[PDB]
Amino acid sequence: IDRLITGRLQSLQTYVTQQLIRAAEIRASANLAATKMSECVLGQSKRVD
Amino acid sequence: DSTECSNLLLQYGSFCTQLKRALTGIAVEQDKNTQEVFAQVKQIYKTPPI
Amino acid sequence: KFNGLTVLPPLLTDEMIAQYTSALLAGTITSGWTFGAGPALQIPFPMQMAYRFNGIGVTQNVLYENQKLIANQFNSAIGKIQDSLSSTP
Amino acid sequence: SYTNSFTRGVYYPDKVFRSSVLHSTQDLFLPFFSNVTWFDNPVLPFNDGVYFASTEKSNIIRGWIFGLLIVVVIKVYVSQKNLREFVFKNFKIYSKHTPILPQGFSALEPLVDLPIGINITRFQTLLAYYVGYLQPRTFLLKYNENGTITDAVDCALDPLSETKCTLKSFTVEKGIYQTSNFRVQPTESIVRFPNITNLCPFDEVFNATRFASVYAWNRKRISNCVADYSVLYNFAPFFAFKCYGVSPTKLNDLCFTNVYADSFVIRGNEVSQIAPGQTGNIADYNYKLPDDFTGCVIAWNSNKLDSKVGGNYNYRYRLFRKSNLKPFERDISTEIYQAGNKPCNGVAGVNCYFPLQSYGFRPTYGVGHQPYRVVVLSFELLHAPATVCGPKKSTNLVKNKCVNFNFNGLTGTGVLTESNKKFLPFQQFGRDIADTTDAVRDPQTLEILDITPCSFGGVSVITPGTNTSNQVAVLYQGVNCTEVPNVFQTRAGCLIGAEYVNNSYECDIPIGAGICASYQQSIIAYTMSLGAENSVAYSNNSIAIPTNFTISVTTEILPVSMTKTSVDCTMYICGDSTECSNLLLQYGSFCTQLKRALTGIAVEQDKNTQEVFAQVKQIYKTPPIKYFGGFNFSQILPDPSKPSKRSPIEDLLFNKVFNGLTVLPPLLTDEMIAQYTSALLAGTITSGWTFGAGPALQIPFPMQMAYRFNGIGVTQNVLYENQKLIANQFNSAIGKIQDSLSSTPSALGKLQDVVNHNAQALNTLVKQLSSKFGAISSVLNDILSRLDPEAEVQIDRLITGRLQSLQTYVTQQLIRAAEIRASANLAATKMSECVLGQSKRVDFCGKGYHLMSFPQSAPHGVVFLHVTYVPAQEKNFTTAPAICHDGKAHFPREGVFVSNGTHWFVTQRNFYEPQIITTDNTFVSGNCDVVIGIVNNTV
Amino acid sequence: GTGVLTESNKKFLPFQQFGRDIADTTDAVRDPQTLEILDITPCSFGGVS
Amino acid sequence: YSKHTLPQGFSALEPLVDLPIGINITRFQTL
Numbered sequence A: 001i002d003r004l005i006t007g008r009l010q011s012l013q014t015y016v017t018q019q020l021i022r023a024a025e026i027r028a029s030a031n032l033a034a035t036k037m038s039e040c041v042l043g044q045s046k047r048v049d
Numbered sequence B: 001d002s003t004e005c006s007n008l009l010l011q012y013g014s015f016c017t018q019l020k021r022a023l024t025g026i027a028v029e030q031d032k033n034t035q036e037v038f039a040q041v042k043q044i045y046k047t048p049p050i
Numbered sequence C: 001k002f003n004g005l006t007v008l009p010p011l012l013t014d015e016m017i018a019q020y021t022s023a024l025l026a027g028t029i030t031s032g033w034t035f036g037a038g039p040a041l042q043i044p045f046p047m048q049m050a051y052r053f054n055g056i057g058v059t060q061n062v063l064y065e066n067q068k069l070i071a072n073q074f075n076s077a078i079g080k081i082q083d084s085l086s087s088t089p
Numbered sequence D: 001s002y003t004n005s006f007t008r009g010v011y012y013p014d015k016v017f018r019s020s021v022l023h024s025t026q027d028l029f030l031p032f033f034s035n036v037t038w039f040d041n042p043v044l045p046f047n048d049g050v051y052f053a054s055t056e057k058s059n060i061i062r063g064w065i066f067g068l069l070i071v072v073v074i075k076v077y078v079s080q081k082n083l084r085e086f087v088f089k090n091f092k093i094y095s096k097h098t099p100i101l102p103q104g105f106s107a108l109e110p111l112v113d114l115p116i117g118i119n120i121t122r123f124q125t126l127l128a129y130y131v132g133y134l135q136p137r138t139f140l141l142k143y144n145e146n147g148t149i150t151d152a153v154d155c156a157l158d159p160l161s162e163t164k165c166t167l168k169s170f171t172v173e174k175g176i177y178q179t180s181n182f183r184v185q186p187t188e189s190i191v192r193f194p195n196i197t198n199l200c201p202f203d204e205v206f207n208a209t210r211f212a213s214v215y216a217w218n219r220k221r222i223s224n225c226v227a228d229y230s231v232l233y234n235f236a237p238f239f240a241f242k243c244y245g246v247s248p249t250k251l252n253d254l255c256f257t258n259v260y261a262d263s264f265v266i267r268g269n270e271v272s273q274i275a276p277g278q279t280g281n282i283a284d285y286n287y288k289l290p291d292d293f294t295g296c297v298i299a300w301n302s303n304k305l306d307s308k309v310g311g312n313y314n315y316r317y318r319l320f321r322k323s324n325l326k327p328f329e330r331d332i333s334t335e336i337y338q339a340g341n342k343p344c345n346g347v348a349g350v351n352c353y354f355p356l357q358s359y360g361f362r363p364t365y366g367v368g369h370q371p372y373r374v375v376v377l378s379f380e381l382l383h384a385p386a387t388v389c390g391p392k393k394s395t396n397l398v399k400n401k402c403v404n405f406n407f408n409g410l411t412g413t414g415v416l417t418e419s420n421k422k423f424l425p426f427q428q429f430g431r432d433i434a435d436t437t438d439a440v441r442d443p444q445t446l447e448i449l450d451i452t453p454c455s456f457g458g459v460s461v462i463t464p465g466t467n468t469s470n471q472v473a474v475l476y477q478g479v480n481c482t483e484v485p486n487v488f489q490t491r492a493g494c495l496i497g498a499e500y501v502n503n504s505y506e507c508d509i510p511i512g513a514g515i516c517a518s519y520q521q522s523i524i525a526y527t528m529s530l531g532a533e534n535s536v537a538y539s540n541n542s543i544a545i546p547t548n549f550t551i552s553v554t555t556e557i558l559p560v561s562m563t564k565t566s567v568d569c570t571m572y573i574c575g576d577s578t579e580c581s582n583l584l585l586q587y588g589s590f591c592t593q594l595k596r597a598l599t600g601i602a603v604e605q606d607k608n609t610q611e612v613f614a615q616v617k618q619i620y621k622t623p624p625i626k627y628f629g630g631f632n633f634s635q636i637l638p639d640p641s642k643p644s645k646r647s648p649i650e651d652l653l654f655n656k657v658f659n660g661l662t663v664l665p666p667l668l669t670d671e672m673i674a675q676y677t678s679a680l681l682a683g684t685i686t687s688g689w690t691f692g693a694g695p696a697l698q699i700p701f702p703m704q705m706a707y708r709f710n711g712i713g714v715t716q717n718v719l720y721e722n723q724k725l726i727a728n729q730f731n732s733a734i735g736k737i738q739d740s741l742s743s744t745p746s747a748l749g750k751l752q753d754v755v756n757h758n759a760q761a762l763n764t765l766v767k768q769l770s771s772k773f774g775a776i777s778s779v780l781n782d783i784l785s786r787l788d789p790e791a792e793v794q795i796d797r798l799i800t801g802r803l804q805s806l807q808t809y810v811t812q813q814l815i816r817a818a819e820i821r822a823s824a825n826l827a828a829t830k831m832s833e834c835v836l837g838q839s840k841r842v843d844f845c846g847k848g849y850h851l852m853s854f855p856q857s858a859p860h861g862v863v864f865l866h867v868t869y870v871p872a873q874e875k876n877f878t879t880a881p882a883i884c885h886d887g888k889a890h891f892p893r894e895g896v897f898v899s900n901g902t903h904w905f906v907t908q909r910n911f912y913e914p915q916i917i918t919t920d921n922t923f924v925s926g927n928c929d930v931v932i933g934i935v936n937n938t939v
Numbered sequence E: 001g002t003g004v005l006t007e008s009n010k011k012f013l014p015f016q017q018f019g020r021d022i023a024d025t026t027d028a029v030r031d032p033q034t035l036e037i038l039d040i041t042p043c044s045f046g047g048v049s
Numbered sequence F: 001y002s003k004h005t006l007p008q009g010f011s012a013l014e015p016l017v018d019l020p021i022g023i024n025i026t027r028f029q030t031l
Ligand SMILES: *[C@@H]1O[C@H](CO)[C@@H](O)[C@H](O)[C@H]1NC(C)=O
Pocket: D202, D203, D206, D207, D231, D232
């Protein structure tokens, strides 16, 4: 039974670790959409591209 | 569906709590992420009838 | 649903996420840059645009003098967006 | 009678002196607020432990008799207003005596402990007395400085009590917490097997008009058939029924590949001979069973059915055989036997004999000589799949209720329900994507029934705050309200304890799916309000221009660094043990890589700190006389008496925020981080944008602003014309920030979060040391002491678990450092584009039009005070895009045409400064006809 | 254990033989002969650069 | 397994019968 638990606990840790890395990519895009909402939607940007 | 497995699992202890706190933080951020993108408005404005 | 795996619902409903976009879209049409830096102050939309041309180096004479053409090129451009997406790239 | 025990029955759990700590112990304790019989001395039970107590004034109760006797002796071993409380667990005798069941907390000191060595189940008091029963519970216990258990919380008594144990505190802040999980429990157990009988033909062998004679004992092979052995057992009149191979009741559930039913008729005396390893005439020459034979032998009298008055002479037995017969072997030969020489032919004689002499059967013959037909079932197993496998009776299917279900070999627990799926005739079970059984066909009725998971989910407790109230509301996430055992249903789940209110407000504790909760004397739930509606007066010709404004100081806290930690993996994984260190070296690479990753995190923390603060080149200083146009920076500039140059706002921010494991100090001291801030502040005050772009030039502060006004589209005249109003609006705004950050919100939440996250991670790391990981014990010394080669394997188990604990820590710190690098990267961009220049990025450096910003050093980050210009006091006017004079459009070089009803004026956009229209402010470009909205005026 | 024994200001209750800090590490022992609390502190360890 | 319908078509064969012979067979013949 312990062997199954060690594998299952590792699989949950790999999922949680991967979701934290994926959450950081979405946090960066949410942060750019928040900057784009303020400087494109709420004002005209002079930044290029 | 196994009480026998559950008794053995408690020996690790911190593993289940750490996973739930980590997943709970991801969940709260997902809500903060959508309130920074779209709650940039203090009041709900409406377009005119014509 | 699953072996312990649940999907917790988003706090902001798709209708609430869609009235935020509508207010963001009506403060912009009615006032302009104004609703983000203080109380939202009204200006006619052809006028908000004349200020946005003045702010990219072109001058105000160009929008009033080409208002219908800029408005029609603008309307036609908005139409293709749905068609390109519906056709699907 | 019955009484309620109020927080009574707590005892010191062990002899450890723990000081000023809240420690959670899982042990047998009296459930808080339980039932306590009251008194009179009947004998009572001792199921586990008893909280006997005896309120008394005259010492009338003098002993407890347990079966041990205590009266002063404790024999079984002999030893040396009232409220005598005595917990007993088997036989520790924790006890306390207090002068006054009363409502108070009195932990029981373990005054007496005894090595009795016996089992006690009952007891009596030798003579008010109250008896309560101890039950396994988890309790969080609060020790004071003197090591005494002042207070405790039971984690099953209430939803709040579980929340307090989860947070390991006696105080809970307002919010939704996931205390535990909810599971519906199976109501019953259903076993089902196929309806088809597949009846074996035992009927045609056990009873038939005629039976086989012993010499040709008949054998019938029985297979591919279910059989009910108990049908033979129920009558129970058999002379024998002895089952040598296995128990008679046990036969039905067993599976055997083939059962061989051999039937013969033998006289009563010889029924005993047909047994494994039995020797006699009919068990030697004819049918013989081996020592290893497995089967059940059944026999019954038959004087009427078989015997006849004339004399039945049609059964015949083998009385002379030359050679003994091997087990389960039959010989049908009539070959004359003849022990002896003189060749006897096929014709019998002096020693030659028919080897098949005759049984004579008659009715008058006494029991033991009358015919007793017998069967010798011989169940057997072969490597091929067994067929002869009797089925269980089965139980009626229960539908729509969670049940434990076993069908044709498939075991699962679920709610059985009707299914519209049509399985192909061969198909039995159905399986969804992810390989889970999701359908089944009942073996007896051949109909498709779905299998659905029993309700399960999360229990989250909505608390207004222990300080505000002890009332709580519970959300069962993803459960229909019908299955939970006022009550409301949301897409989040079923909410109990909160009543829905139609009126809408701002969110307090988010519940989910659009619905929030709060505390009114009660707890109300509602649809969150995104905000108050505000239709703008959109129109073809109408403008709004701001006639006055506000100077607003706003505060943003951005983290810039995290704690530099260093771990000695040998001290953490092993620690003062020579043998463990050798085993750790076997992997070798892990320790250096863990140390290298942690060194990289630490060096980055210094770069993160010096990319934000070290933006100035020389240490700028402020002038002796601080008159800056009336602007008062005393709140921002350094004060010498304070804990360094720490300013008064910096002083408030600073006040408001092992074993293997170290902390390395930051290279830049808090005093240097304050000197860097002072130089960044000193140049901005007496130079402006200049210090960042080259040599730091000088302009007076009233003249640095008026050039920060020009950036936001406001003419210079506004600051020079209205200097003192702006200076006081600025001084008051700076004054409120000390008060607003003073305690109004969790301002320094972002910086305190970083301290909290790091501490919780180190605490998990130290606690993970306690986990066994499946070895005999966590302590290395004990594993080494208990075992001799055997110990090395168990130590290896701990090293693997502890290395995984350290590996998880470094991986999490690398992910945490990435967020601090991103915060340090934005903090560095805010220093350059705000402190060292004025940003035109919208809502980058303050909400409003940026005028300036000031850096303040908080403990592990920076706080920026962003001065911004907010327009105010709007008035509405009429706007025409161009004013037509002399047939020429006259748009204005900078300004918006506006009208006070009759007169027409050009105005600055963000301030109402009306001016008459003349060619200097107006540019002519075109003809009157093309423009739409042109008005007629003189310029 | 290996450690440094020092005089203690802690007042152990009469039945309490040992003391533990947060993290459950023995921090104090009441000496058996004189019934007086003697603290335990680990000997010096640190990084060398 | 068997089916009744060489054509270029796909027809999976349902399990007609399973026999508990328990003996190895390495040769086939037809009548
Ligand atoms: C024969 O045996 C079967 C099984 O015990 C029993 O049910 C049945 O009644 C018997 N029939 C006769 C004719 O003895």
